[PDB]
Amino acid sequence: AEPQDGFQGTRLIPTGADFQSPPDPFIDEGVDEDSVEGRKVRHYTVNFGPQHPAAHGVLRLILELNGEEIVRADPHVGLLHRGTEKLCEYKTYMQ
91 binds another protein (CB under 8 A): no
User: Do residues 63 and 46 touch, judged by C-beta distance below 8 A?
Assistant: yes
Footprint of another protein on residues 42-71 (CB under 8 A)? Answer: 46-49, 51-52, 60
Instruction: Tell me the pairing of strands 60-66 and 44-48.
Output: antiparallel
Residue type, 83: G
Q: Which of 39, 31, 41, 45 is nearest to 74 (CA)?
A: 45
User: Residue 71 in contact with residue 45, Cβ under 8 Å?
Assistant: no
Binding mask 18-47 toward another protein (x if CB under 8 A, else -) reads: ----------------------------xx
Q: Tell me: does residue 78 bind another protein (CB under 8 A).
A: no
**Apex 84 CA angle, 81 and 90, nearest 5:** 145
Q: Minimum distance between the CB of residue 24 and another protein, rounded to whole angstroms? A: 41
With binding defined as CB under 8 A, does residue 86 bind another protein?
no
- Is residue 88 close enough to count as binding another protein by CB under 8 A? no
Contacts with another protein, residue ranges (CB under 8 A): 46-49, 51-52, 60
